[PDB]
Write an enzyme that holds these catalytic residues in place. Structure first.
Site, PDB file in Angstrom:
ATOM      1  N   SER B 156      12.410  18.821  30.508  1.00 30.97           N
ATOM      2  CA  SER B 156      11.556  19.670  29.599  1.00 30.97           C
ATOM      3  C   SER B 156      11.727  19.331  27.920  1.00 30.97           C
ATOM      4  O   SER B 156      11.912  20.574  27.309  1.00 30.97           O
ATOM      5  CB  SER B 156      11.789  20.524  29.580  1.00 30.97           C
ATOM      6  OG  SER B 156      12.061  21.800  31.723  1.00 30.97           O
ATOM      7  N   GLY B 193       7.939  20.137  32.159  1.00 31.46           N
ATOM      8  CA  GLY B 193       8.047  19.594  31.464  1.00 31.46           C
ATOM      9  C   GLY B 193       7.325  19.148  30.013  1.00 31.46           C
ATOM     10  O   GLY B 193       7.485  18.707  28.773  1.00 31.46           O
ATOM     11  N   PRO B 231       3.776  23.650  35.270  1.00 32.78           N
ATOM     12  CA  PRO B 231       4.100  23.705  34.719  1.00 32.78           C
ATOM     13  C   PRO B 231       4.442  25.234  33.798  1.00 32.78           C
ATOM     14  O   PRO B 231       4.446  26.600  34.755  1.00 32.78           O
ATOM     15  CB  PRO B 231       2.617  23.963  33.286  1.00 32.78           C
ATOM     16  CG  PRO B 231       1.724  24.365  33.898  1.00 32.78           C
ATOM     17  CD  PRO B 231       2.059  23.183  35.821  1.00 32.78           C
ATOM     18  N   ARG B 233       7.387  26.405  30.607  1.00 30.15           N
ATOM     19  CA  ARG B 233       7.290  26.788  29.228  1.00 30.15           C
ATOM     20  C   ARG B 233       5.944  26.082  28.536  1.00 30.15           C
ATOM     21  O   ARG B 233       5.263  27.227  27.859  1.00 30.15           O
ATOM     22  CB  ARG B 233       8.565  26.306  28.428  1.00 30.15           C
ATOM     23  CG  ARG B 233       8.370  24.283  28.360  1.00 30.15           C
ATOM     24  CD  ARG B 233       9.517  24.195  27.678  1.00 30.15           C
ATOM     25  NE  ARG B 233      10.131  23.169  28.579  1.00 30.15           N
ATOM     26  CZ  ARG B 233      12.244  23.781  28.177  1.00 30.15           C
ATOM     27  NH1 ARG B 233      12.261  24.889  27.257  1.00 30.15           N
ATOM     28  NH2 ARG B 233      12.743  24.072  29.336  1.00 30.15           N
ATOM     29  N   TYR B 274      21.992  28.108  28.271  1.00 29.07           N
ATOM     30  CA  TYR B 274      21.099  27.442  29.441  1.00 29.07           C
ATOM     31  C   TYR B 274      20.554  26.166  29.396  1.00 29.07           C
ATOM     32  O   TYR B 274      20.420  25.394  30.174  1.00 29.07           O
ATOM     33  CB  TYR B 274      21.113  28.100  30.210  1.00 29.07           C
ATOM     34  CG  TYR B 274      22.075  29.142  31.551  1.00 29.07           C
ATOM     35  CD1 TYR B 274      22.061  30.211  30.688  1.00 29.07           C
ATOM     36  CD2 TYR B 274      22.585  29.231  33.044  1.00 29.07           C
ATOM     37  CE1 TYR B 274      23.408  31.168  31.538  1.00 29.07           C
ATOM     38  CE2 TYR B 274      23.319  29.677  33.268  1.00 29.07           C
ATOM     39  CZ  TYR B 274      23.974  30.931  32.895  1.00 29.07           C
ATOM     40  OH  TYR B 274      24.301  31.399  33.474  1.00 29.07           O
ATOM     41  N   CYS B 303      31.602  42.100  23.070  1.00 29.55           N
ATOM     42  CA  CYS B 303      32.796  41.460  22.813  1.00 29.55           C
ATOM     43  C   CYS B 303      34.063  39.497  22.481  1.00 29.55           C
ATOM     44  O   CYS B 303      34.462  39.911  21.220  1.00 29.55           O
ATOM     45  CB  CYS B 303      33.748  41.974  23.675  1.00 29.55           C
ATOM     46  SG  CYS B 303      33.605  42.178  25.730  1.00 29.55           S
TER      47      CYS B 303
END
EC number: 4.1.1.17
Lengths: 352, 353
Positions: B156, B193, B231, B233, B274, B303
């Site tokens: 990607s 990608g 596809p 993203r 990620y 935290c």
């Protein structure tokens, strides 16, 4: 064959006996963010531990099981004003801070809160520098803040125990500036970071001896002082064992690739957020002579970086056998997601 | 003031119009893992897309909105055998594989599946080397497997579109080996990608033109042939805009500010860790005359000392209770969230442009 956990609650009971033996002056407020499973919180509460809560949600969860609000510290330095309102209305009064801006919020929303100043040791994220602490307490006095003590956090895996001594000595300096300006300082909170596997290199019993000696030097016993800590991984890391099925297999000098049904988006998120190193254990007993092959082990998702082990020596394994991962109780269930639709492992409970 | 998304569904319509014009031969099978929101699936289904699903839960989800199972491809090469039974009992027949061991389970559990062989380009994790594909297909022949095509995934974020021309040329070689051995090869799947921010460095329209040229040479049109892609993203990255509240602020005397916000790396910014995302904070207050700017960092609410979003960015001085916006937050963001420390993920609201 879906992945599952075995949680041994009797392991949590033995950790608690060892804490009381090595740190009899220190009352432990379990860091609920480490592992918030309802049985684990209910075992710890039956044992008489306090709770450290970091959000309106955790406060809600520990009251839910019966725990009174005086056994809660709200130990998040930087709180959304509506979660502070929620703490006050549940009766939780002890909170932390480490700058004057937070005291401004507390003055407007929870004027009688018992506030504990956290000093740096840990992070750029949290912790006031000792050289700024006079100015902060002078501003606290102007805002009529009931400052009651000092806290710190060394962090969850040191090679020296000497960081605890230096933090304790710095805490006494800041504690005496408090008393000189008229505050009733009576709490020392020495934070978290104790190892949760009895086979760590820096053992729990040597850290504790270093802490007891610094305490005896800078905070001698007195009925007006309470010493507290915020342990999380110490109580739970070794109580949970994960089991995962081998769902697919590739063969390539010979090498093997195994695919299992839990990964870095699920329970092994500790590999990326907690820097964990994990070791796969065949559930089948080691059988005489066995040959061992270079193997990698992968999570179930589409993602090329969902990989659990890159090169470990294993026997040859078959689709449908099981791999075990020990010491999987800390920072593991709490950071899981349902990426790609995979579901998190059910938990089953034993009492040792 | 809790954090919240705005999702513009008409940005998803406009992405689909651009796809049809630049890749008119290619049917899109949306990758549901990227963003599985119910309105984004319902909009894409209405526009005529197919669905790439990776688990039994995804298949359940898109059937639940009324998508028939012929518009689903089960594109996970290494599947749990009870998820394979689930797909067979759902009517889902097209699935991928990339080794001989996966075909052994398929022949025991879903013997009539239509199987698409994935070749490497993307990963040590997935994709058969084209030098092993002859041997893989001879074994597929003994297992009586209906192999119907070839797939690949370039990954990607290339800066060169030339990986697609190599992949397409490799795909044709493995397609001819399949025909030679007697399989009925009629699907090519060119994977995922494509950028989803119309202003990523390597543009959609340039990648499309390289693909179309490779296709015209190696895969000329024919009524037996369908080309498909996966596809993710592309369709959703710029549709979602996140709003987070500054809940706390620190000031260092060089003047510098640290701001703490109520979503972070365990929440919607899990994409920083990620998916290698780099994000850019925008004050929702309009840029105001002469503004002095200061070097600033921005942190999540947990935290954890490593829950930080922005390490040094120039912002006007902000106040507790004001809002920061992060655009292009629809891809790999909501789906990777957890409830670490108790914090809850942001509600979504919807506009149709």
């Amino acid at each position: 064959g879906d992945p599952f956990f075995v949680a041994d609650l009797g392991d949590i009971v033995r950790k608690h006996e060892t804490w009381k033996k090595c740190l009899p002056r220190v009352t432990p407020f379990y860091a609920v963010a480490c592992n918030d499973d309802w049985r684990v919180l209910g075992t710890l509460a039956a044992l008489g531990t306090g709770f450290d809560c970091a959000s309106n949600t955790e406060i809600q969860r520990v009251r839910g099981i019966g725990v009174p609000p005086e056994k809660i510290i709200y130990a998040n330095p930087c709180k959304q004003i509506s979660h502070i309102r929620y703490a006050r209305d549940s009766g939780v009064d002890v909170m932390t801070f480490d700058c004057v801006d937070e005291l401004e919020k507390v003055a407007k929303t929870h004027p009688k809160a018992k506030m504990v100043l956290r000093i740096s040791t840990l992070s750029v994220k949290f912790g006031a520098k000792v050289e700024d602490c006079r100015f902060i307490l002078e501003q606290a006095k102007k805002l009529n803040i009931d400052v009651t003590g000092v806290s710190f956090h060394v962090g969850s895996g040191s090679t020296d125990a000497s960081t605890f001594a230096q933090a304790i000595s710095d805490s006494r300096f800041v504690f005496d500036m408090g008393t000189e300006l008229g505050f009733n300082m009576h709490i020392l909170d020495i934070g978290g970071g104790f190892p949760g596997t009895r086979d760590a290199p820096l053992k729990f019993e040597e850290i504790a001896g270093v802490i007891n000696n610094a305490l005896e030097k800078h905070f001698p016993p007195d009925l007006k002082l309470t010493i507290v800590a915020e342990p999380g991984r110490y109580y739970v890391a070794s109580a949970f064992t994960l089991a995962v099925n081998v769902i697919a297999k590739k063969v390539t000098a010979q090498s093997f690739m195994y695919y299992v049904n839990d990964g870095v988006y699920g329970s092994f998120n500790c590999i990326l957020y907690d820097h964990a190193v994990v070791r796969p254990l065949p559930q089948r007993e080691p059988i005489p002579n066995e040959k061992l092959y270079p193997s990698s082990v992968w999570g179930p998702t589409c993602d090329g970086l969902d990989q659990i082990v890159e090169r470990y020596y294993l026997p040859e394994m078959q689709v449908g056998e099981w791999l075990l991962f020990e010491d999987m109780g800390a920072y593991t269930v709490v950071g899981t997601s349902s990426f790609n639709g995979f579901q998190s492992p059910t938990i089953y409970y034993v009492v040792s």
